[PDB]
Design a binder for this molecule. Structure first.
Ligand SMILES: Cc1cc2nc3c(=O)[nH]c(=O)nc-3n(C[C@H](O)[C@H](O)[C@H](O)COP(=O)(O)OP(=O)(O)OC[C@H]3O[C@@H](n4cnc5c(N)ncnc54)[C@H](O)[C@@H]3O)c2cc1C
Ligand SMILES: Cc1cc2nc3c(=O)[nH]c(=O)nc-3n(C[C@H](O)[C@H](O)[C@H](O)COP(=O)(O)OP(=O)(O)OC[C@H]3O[C@@H](n4cnc5c(N)ncnc54)[C@H](O)[C@@H]3O)c2cc1C
Ligand SMILES: Cc1cc2nc3c(=O)[nH]c(=O)nc-3n(C[C@H](O)[C@H](O)[C@H](O)COP(=O)(O)OP(=O)(O)OC[C@H]3O[C@@H](n4cnc5c(N)ncnc54)[C@H](O)[C@@H]3O)c2cc1C
Ligand SMILES: Cc1cc2nc3c(=O)[nH]c(=O)nc-3n(C[C@H](O)[C@H](O)[C@H](O)COP(=O)(O)OP(=O)(O)OC[C@H]3O[C@@H](n4cnc5c(N)ncnc54)[C@H](O)[C@@H]3O)c2cc1C
Lengths: 242, 239, 242, 240
C-alpha cells in the first residue's frame, strides 16, 4: 500500500519476504511451515522479543519506495543496516518539488526556493553539468529511494524515529511505516508495541528505587492483577529483584 | 527446492524476495514494475554488475534452510553480511549424525565414544550445554541463512574457488545452482564478469601493454562478441 | 594486559584506539583534543549513552587476543559487528589443548579427548589432509583468534554475554573483557553499568503496574534520595507517569 | 596530519590503530609483535591482499576529521562500513561557508539570500532543525569518519576512479596520501593489485588466450621482476 506523508512525500510497500509465520518458522529451524497455533506462535514470538533472541526477526524483510526531503533522507540514511538506492542528482535532472511546512516551529522560504531553483535552471542552460548544478538547491528538495530492511532493524528504526526526540518530519515517516508493519506482521508488532515502543528502560538507580519502595510479593500481585503469569511474571520480578 | 549435500546434509530454499526484475526495478527506483524488454533489462543488469553499482543487487534476497557439519558452518559463518539462526546445542538435544566422508582428501570409533559419553553425561544429568562439549567437529548441525544477492555472489565467488575447502565448496555449488535458476539475468552477468573472470595486477597489464596493441586487442575482443561500452571499457583497462 | 580465563584460556588487550576523551571528542567534532573537564565530559558521556547517541562510542576501538574453547568461540562469533582472524584448522596442527571444566553443571571427558586426539595424529600420520583430520576433535578444543570491535558494539556484546541467561563459560570471558574495558574507559563503563548492564527494560504492563502501586511525589523522593535530580529525574518520572 | 581540500575543506588524521605490522601480527594471531623482516612482511602483505584474505587488513583503523560540502558528504555516506558523527543542524548554528568552485564544468547571491533567510528565520524564533532547510547542498559540513583499512581501501578504489565525482575524488586523493604514508607496505600492495590493476571478464581472458602463449606471456612478466607464486598466478588466469 501507499501512504502520503508531508505535503508531497509518501511511503509505499514495494515487496515483503515473510510474515509472523516466518519468524516462528526460522526460530524452529523447520523443514516445513514451522507453524503451530496462533496463541502458541504469538507466545513464541512474544518470548523472542522479550529475551532479545533477534535472529528470527531478521528472517522477515520489507522494501519501501520513499519520497522525502533531503534533510529527512540524511537522518534516515544514518541507519547503516539497510540497503538503499536513491535517485542520483548526477545523472537525472531534479524535479522542482520542495517540502513546505504546515507551519514553522519555535526554538521567505518560498523565495529562496525560487531563487535557488532559478539558479539551478540558469546554470543548466549554460551547459553546467548536472552533478554540479544541483548544489545550489536547498535541503528541503524532495528525493526518492528504495529502502530495504529486515524486521529486527526496522523495529530499531521505528523505536528511534518514533521517539519524540526525532525530528517531526521523520517521525511522520516512521508513523507511516509503523502502520504498514502493524498490518503485515501483527503478532510481531504486538510484541514490539508491548515490550519496546510502549516500554521504557530504567537505569540502575531507578531499579534501586523500585527496591526499598516495593517488595517482591507486592509487585507480583500488582502485575498478575494486570494479567501477567508464569515466565512473564517471574521475569518481570527478576528484572527488579533477581 | 531441497538439494542434498554430503552424506546427511542439504541446502533448501525457504523463501525469496525479488528476481532479475527487482534489480532493474530498484535501479530505476520505479513506481511500478520498473521493467522493459528482457534485452534492455539484461543489458542494465550487466552494466550495474560491471560498474559496481551494487545497491540494486541488494534488493534481492534469498533465505535457505541448511544442514551441514559444524566444521563447515564455522567457515560459512565467517561471512558476516547475513542473518542466521541455528539449532542451539544449549536448548535442544543433538541427533546422532556425523559427516562420514566418502573419501579422505576409526572415525566411527571416536563418534561412538564421543556420542557415548554424550548420553552418559546426559544420563548422569549434566547440563546439556556442557554435554555436547564432547561431540566431534564433524557432528551435523542445522540453520537458516538469509542473505542478499550481492553478498551471496561474494559468498559464491569465495566458496566456489578451488582454495575453499571441498565440503564448503559443494554447499556453494548447491547454492549456486539454485541462484542461477531464480535470477538468470543476474547469474549470467556474475558468471561472465566475476566468477569465471579474473583480476590483473598492474605489472600484468604493463605486460599486456607491451605484447599486444590497441588495434590487435580490439579485433580479438569484438570477434569474440564484445561490442558497445563493454568494448571501450575493456580496451581502457589496458590502454 | 592479560587475564586468564577457564583452565587454559585468556584475554589480552593487543591495542586500543581512543579512550573516554575520544568519545567526547567525536561528539564535538573537534580540530583539537576535544576534551573539556572530567566532570563536563563524564556528563556528556552519560548523556550520549542514556539517549542512545551511539556514534561517539564507535570512535573507540579495542583489539584482543583470545584463547577459548571452540564451542565458546561459536557463541562469540554470533556477534557479526567485529573483525576476527582465527588460526586455521586447515593449515596448522591444533595443539592438544582441551577445556576440562572446573565442575560439571546440573541441568570420561579425559577419555574422549585422549582418543579423539590420537585419531587426529593417526590421520595426520596416515597422510590425511589437515583440513579433514581436525574434524574428529571435540568442541571443547581450545582455539585462538584476534577480535576487534568498537566500544558501542562491545558494550552490546557484554550486555548479552554477562547476563545469567548466557552460558557460564562465555560469561567468564565477558567478565575478563569487562575488567579490561572498565580500566581503560572508566567514564564510558560507569555510564554503561548505570544505564544498561545494571539497568533493565520494562514492558507496558510492567510500567502500568508501577504506576498505580506508586505515586509521582513518592517515586520522586526515592529517586531524588539516591541522587536523581534534573533531566534524569524528569525522565525517570515520565517513564512511569506520562 | 592536515590536508586542505577544495577552497575551504580539509582532511585530518585524528588517530590511527595499527600499521603494516598489525596486519601481519593479526594474520599471525601473534602473542607479541608478530613481525619479521620488512621484506617478508611486505611479501606476506602482498599475498593476503592478492588472495583476498581480508580479515588482517581490518585490524588497522583510521579516524579522520573531515570538512566538505554537504553534497560531498552524501556520497561519502553511501559507504556503510564506517562510523560517522557529523555536526548536527538540529543543535548548533551552521557557519556561513560554501564551496565556491574555482571553475564550473550568481552562486553568491543565492547563498547570501539563503543564509540571510536562514539567519532571518533563526531571529524570528524558528527552530534550528527547520531553519537550516533553506541552505544549499554546497554548504560546508563537518564530521569524524572511522573506517578500517580493508573498507577504507574499497572506498579509495571507488572514489579515486574517473567515474567518481570530481569533488569527492579530491577528498579520496587526500586520504590516499595519508594512507600511503602511514601503511606504506599495505599501500604498495593496494596500488599494485587493486588501484592500478583491472578486472577482466571471461571473454576478455578468452581474447587473451590463444592470442598469446604461456611462454610469450612469462617472457614479458619475468622481464618485470614478476616470478614465483605471482608469476604462476598471472599465467593461470589466462591458461591454468
Ligand atoms: C538523541 C539523538 C541525537 C543524535 N545526534 C547526532 C549528532 O549530533 N550527529 C550525528 O552524526 N548523529 C547523531 N545521531 C544519530 C546516531 O549517532 C546514529 O547514527 C543513528 O541513531 C543510527 O543508530 P544506529 O547506527 O544504531 O542504527 P543502524 O545504523 O541501522 O545500525 C544499527 C546497529 O547495527 C550495528 N552496526 C551497523 N553498521 C555498523 C558499522 N558500520 N560499524 C559498527 N557497527 C555497525 C550497530 O551496533 C548499530 O547500533 C543522534 C541520535 C539520537 C537518537
Ligand atoms: C586464502 C584465504 C585465507 C583465509 N585465512 C583465514 C584465517 O587464517 N583466519 C580467519 O579467521 N579467516 C580467514 N579467511 C577468511 C577471510 O578473512 C574472511 O573472513 C572471509 O573470506 C569473509 O569474507 P568477507 O568478510 O569480505 O565477507 P563478509 O563477512 O559477508 O563481509 C563482506 C564485506 O562487508 C564488510 N563488513 C562486514 N562486516 C564488517 C565489520 N564487522 N566491520 C567492518 N566491515 C565489515 C567488509 O568490507 C567485508 O569485506 C581466509 C580467506 C581466504 C580467501
Ligand atoms: C536468549 C537468547 C537466545 C538465543 N538463541 C539463539 C538460537 O537458538 N540460535 C541462534 O543462532 N542464535 C541465538 N541467539 C543469538 C542471537 O540470535 C544473535 O545472533 C546474537 O545475540 C547477536 O545479537 P546481535 O546480532 O544483535 O549482535 P551483532 O551480531 O554484533 O549485531 C549487532 C546489531 O547490528 C546489526 N547487524 C549486525 N550484523 C547484521 C547483519 N548481518 N544483518 C543485519 N543486521 C546486522 C543488528 O541490528 C544487530 O542487532 C540467542 C540470543 C539470546 C539472547
Ligand atoms: C558507478 C556507480 C554508480 C552508482 N549509482 C548510484 C545511484 O544511482 N543511487 C545510489 O543510491 N547509489 C549509487 N551508487 C552507490 C553504490 O550502489 C554503493 O552504495 C556505494 O558505492 C557503496 O559501495 P558499498 O556498499 O560496497 O560500500 P559499503 O557501504 O562500505 O559496504 C561495503 C560492503 O560491506 C557489505 N555491507 C555493508 N553494509 C551492508 C548492509 N547494510 N547490508 C548488507 N551488506 C552490507 C557489502 O558486501 C558491501 O559491498 C553508485 C556507485 C557506483 C560505483
Amino acid at each position: 500500500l501507499t501512504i502520503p506523508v508531508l505535503d508531497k512525500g509518501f511511503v509505499r510497500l514495494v515487496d515483503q519476504m515473510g510474515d509472523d509465520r516466518a519468524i516462528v518458522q526460522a526460530a524452529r529451524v523447520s523443514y516445513g511451515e514451522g507453524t503451530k497455533t496462533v496463541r502458541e506462535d504469538a507466545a513464541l514470538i512474544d518470548y523472542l522479543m522479550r529475551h532479545r533472541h533477534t535472529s528470527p526477526f531478521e528472517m522477515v524483510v520489507f522494501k519501501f519506495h520513499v519520497k522525502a526531503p533531503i534533510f529527512v533522507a540524511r537522518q534516515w540514511f544514518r541507519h547503516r543496516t539497510a540497503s538503499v538506492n536513491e535517485i542520483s542528482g548526477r545523472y537525472s535532472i531534479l524535479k522542482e518539488e520542495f517540502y513546505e511546512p504546515e507551519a514553522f516551529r519555535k526554538q521567505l522560504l518560498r523565495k529562496v526556493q525560487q531563487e535557488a531553483y532559478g539558479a539551478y535552471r540558469a546554470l543548466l542552460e549554460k551547459g553546467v553539468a548536472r552533478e554540479m548544478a544541483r548544489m545550489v538547491l536547498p535541503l528541503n528538495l524532495y528525493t526518492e529511494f528504495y529502502w530495504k530492511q529486515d524486521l529486527h532493524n526496522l523495529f530499531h528504526f521505528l523505536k528511534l524515529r518514533l521517539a519524540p526526540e526525532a525530528q517531526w518530519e521523520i517521525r511522520q515517516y516512521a508513523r507511516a511505516i509503523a502502520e504498514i508493519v502493524k498490518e503485515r506482521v501483527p503478532l510481531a508488532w504486538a510484541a514490539f508495541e508491548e515490550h519496546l515502543l510502549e516500554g521504557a528502560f530504567l537505569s540502575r538507580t531507578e531499579l534501586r528505587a523500585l527496591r526499598g519502595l516495593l517488595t517482591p510479593e507486592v509487585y507480583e500481585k500488582a502485575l498478575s492483577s494486570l494479567g501477567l503469569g508464569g515466565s512473564r511474571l517471574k521475569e518481570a520480578l527478576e528484572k527488579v529483584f533477581g
